[PDB]
Design a protein around this nucleic acid. Sequence first.
DNA 1: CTCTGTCAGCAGGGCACTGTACTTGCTGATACCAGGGAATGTTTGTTCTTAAATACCATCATTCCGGACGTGTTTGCCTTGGCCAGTTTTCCATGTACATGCAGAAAGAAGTTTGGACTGATCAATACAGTCCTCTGCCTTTAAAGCAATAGGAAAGAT
DNA 2: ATCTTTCCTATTGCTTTAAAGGCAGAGGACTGTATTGATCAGTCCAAACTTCTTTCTGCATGTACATGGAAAACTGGCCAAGGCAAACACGTCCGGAATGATGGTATTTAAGAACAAACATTCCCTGGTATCAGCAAGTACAGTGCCCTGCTGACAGAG
Lengths: 83, 83, 109, 111, 95, 95, 97, 97, 53
Amino acid sequence: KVLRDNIQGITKPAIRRLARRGGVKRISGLIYEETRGVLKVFLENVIRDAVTYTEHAKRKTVTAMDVVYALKRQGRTLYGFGG
Amino acid sequence: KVLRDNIQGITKPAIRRLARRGGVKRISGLIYEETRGVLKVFLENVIRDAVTYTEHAKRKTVTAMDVVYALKRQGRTLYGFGG
Amino acid sequence: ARAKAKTRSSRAGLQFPVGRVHRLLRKGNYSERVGAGAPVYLAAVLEYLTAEILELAGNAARDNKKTRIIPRHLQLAIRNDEELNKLLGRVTIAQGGVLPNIQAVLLPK
Amino acid sequence: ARAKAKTRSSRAGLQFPVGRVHRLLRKGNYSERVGAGAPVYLAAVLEYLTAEILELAGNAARDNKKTRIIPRHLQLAIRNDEELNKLLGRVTIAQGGVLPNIQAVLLPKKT
Amino acid sequence: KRSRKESYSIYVYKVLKQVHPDTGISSKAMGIMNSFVNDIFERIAGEASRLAHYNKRSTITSREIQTAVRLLLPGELAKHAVSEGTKAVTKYTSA
Amino acid sequence: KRSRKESYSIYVYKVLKQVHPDTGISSKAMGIMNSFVNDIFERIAGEASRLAHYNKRSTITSREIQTAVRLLLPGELAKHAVSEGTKAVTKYTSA
Amino acid sequence: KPHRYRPGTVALREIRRYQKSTELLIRKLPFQRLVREIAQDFKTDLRFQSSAVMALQEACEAYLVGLFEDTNLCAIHAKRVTIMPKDIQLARRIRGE
Amino acid sequence: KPHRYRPGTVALREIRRYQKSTELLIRKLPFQRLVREIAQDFKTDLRFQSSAVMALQEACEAYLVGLFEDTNLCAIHAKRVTIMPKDIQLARRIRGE
Amino acid sequence: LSCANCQTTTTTLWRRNAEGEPVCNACGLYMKLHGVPRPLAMRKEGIQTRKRK
DNA sequence: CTCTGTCAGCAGGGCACTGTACTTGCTGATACCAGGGAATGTTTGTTCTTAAATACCATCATTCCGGACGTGTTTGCCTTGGCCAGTTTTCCATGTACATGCAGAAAGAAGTTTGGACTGATCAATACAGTCCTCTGCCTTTAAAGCAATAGGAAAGAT
DNA sequence: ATCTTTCCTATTGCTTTAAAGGCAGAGGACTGTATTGATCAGTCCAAACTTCTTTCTGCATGTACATGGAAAACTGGCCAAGGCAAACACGTCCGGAATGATGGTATTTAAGAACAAACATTCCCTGGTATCAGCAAGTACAGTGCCCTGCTGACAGAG
Ligand SMILES: [Zn+2]
């Protein structure tokens, strides 16, 4: 039911692939923990606004439109899921 | 009537003082021309929106509200001028 | 009796809907009143921007030997144009990827 | 007969104007209709925020041995508080200056 | 049937056929383009609503939309969109 | 005649006296506080309008303002602002 | 001798490969589990649409790719080719986060 | 021998002085002339309120000061203390300008 | 320190009277202007009415 | 040869003296903020109307949990190579200080010009009713794209 | 420079699944007329901007000295890239069900609209206290010359 340590589910190969898409040729060993922390902070920031939007609607299901609104509120507009 | 080369009016000591306010200890000799260019670009960007706001209202006098509003629409919100 | 109805889009010679844009402006709480020419102007602007983006995306897809435009082609069209890239600088395109670039210093000798 | 008029601001116990906030909401074209408690809530929030900023600015002015708050004091109060700084991170304050801050490596060494 | 949800799909497809007669568009691209149209509409409408409140005007006219287009769109796009809008309004007024 | 210009100066001064009885405030600082109050009012009202529009609601009630405050203000500021808003609304309703 | 590419060649190969493609790079199920773990702290028993999780993954990977681009720029500025945590810290500081 | 501070001491003194104060650092009249020149390209025979010029100057000074803090951070990242045009370019690139 | 006339522990600018003892700014200005000590009734006081974290 | 005494020189670091710049205290000048009086426009009270939100029920859709199987991905380990950090040197390009003159700041005055108030007017948007036809949902068809297999060319690394 | 190996790209056959096309209907667009309130046009004035003139210096410019920070060269070791093999857990699908989102009706609660009173807010005018400016001591800190204390390359000389 509950989930405890799934931040480690973002494995080193995934971070390496993300860096490679960004044009990175060589990656330091300490980069992975820093990237995990940054991703956790970003996810918390987005999900808090998404859950607030869901709660205001008196719903219990976090819809994609809530996520789109949360991203737009942070100046990170996302195309593809709106509507 | 016609102003020609007043970009040089942003003197070397003025840029030096601005750098000092930013915590800069040592300033390369080529910093001044780059700073003048950057300031020119920023001023053009702000004054374009300010003049557009002035022209929309059919006024010929650029008021402080227009400058404040042009700054606001660029994410540079300014307090202390009737905002 | 009523004459043959003609859509305002047809009168303005546009493909986009003038009536829908006018209704959206009215119900969007943007102004207490809406001018007659405002929806026409806005529809024309939207149609022009759509036409520009679609032209660039179709050129990109044709260069890729693909018949149908996909999000990758939209991303390539947007990020290869300076004006559109500046307009959509903060936008994220789903499944769009990134432009292929490698810093020259990283290349081998 | 008509009862004695009592301002809604006094009814809510606030110092800020409930009536003016309601009027601005109605004239601001934010929605077709405005609820009764919306201006009260908004006025309370605004009063709390300005009270916080004024408290911090007054403390800063007292630190500077000054009796009247000035824009420098407001800048010092805002930038020295993490929450207010995050709230007003994109804002420029006229005559506010900047926080005194020099990078450690720039300071003189010993040898 | 389900509740109707409106979208700009058919108009985007018509514009695509006008521009590239033999090119199609996938559903994901149609969704992205619908989001783009909605975003630009929101930006221009918000800027025009501001401009109207800004001069204590009650109505958004063609001039407000023109000023919003001038403020938002960069460079050559601004003047091209302004010309297109002026042409459309001129055609509409003559009926 | 000439048009009167309204502002929050008297209310800001009243709050200042209630907080710091002896501290004054200069005109430039008062203008800065006016601008700050206007900015926060605009932010909260716009977010409340967006929240109402998303749910297809026609009214901006205290719930919309509360959600907007929770969205915009960070952390402890949001919590204390919500507490003050709820206190004010309860006191107003009870009277 | 067995064939072995010198260091950096396969790095460039992967850079080209992943810049050409568009598919998601994070495994979907662990990211969904992470999203649920983070969301449970804000409200218990939250239902999630699949599209919501997909949008979260798109946004997160786009943000991380942009951050890595800025990190690589910072690394190259310091006459290095290896990104380090200080580079990410500088990128975040300059971006205003 | 006449007194002479070593390089960098007066720089730190000026840093402290100008961070302690708040007065505008650019001379008013040349900046006003620059603003009028820039506005001349958009609309001829314009007129400026004094408060408008003051607001433009305040915004420009704040923007330049922030850009210089970012430039200083970039220069410190490269193990230097002298800001260079490459530092300003990196700072503007990361900020999205 | 405190004002020799009205005994305020806080003032914007400490001054001195003819006797040389310290006096607060308001008392000093009032004495210099009118030739009479500043009344303690004229002196103002206040108590804070709001607090937070 | 081993090791120990004797010279000479350069390095770290401490401390006293001189000199510069900043801070603090006092007096005097001033300027701008708090307090009091006239005016106006905006808020509150009361009533009615009506429409937006609420409570209950039904229902279906869509998300959660579990299970099973295939295999692509992850992770631990080993080898090694080349990139980052430390050290040394150089020289040039910046910092500091001094002297000169020039234009920016401030004050005063005159000109002028235009932003906003006021009145009349006119025209363009909203409200309402009736008509109808364009857009969205559902269903069917077919071709563009995906997957598998093969073959040829380009590029990396080794001799 | 040539040979070997790896990857990438290009080409061809099957299929599959997603886009293109067709039909039903309804709700949202469109047409026409009356109402009205927002906006436009002309005049005026005052206040606020632009222009010109004089003083007065502070501040920018130019010059000279020289210091230390940026950049290049060299070294090495250690941190990360590449590859192999086993494990695993992701991916895909399939089913049960249970939870929550949607839709409809009675209703009930709350907000819009209108009109008058008056009272809170704006503007204008005055004193008086906080803040600015100048001078003088006091303090802090930077630069530098001298000295004591360590050390080390080198040479000289008894076992
Ligand atoms: Zn006293």
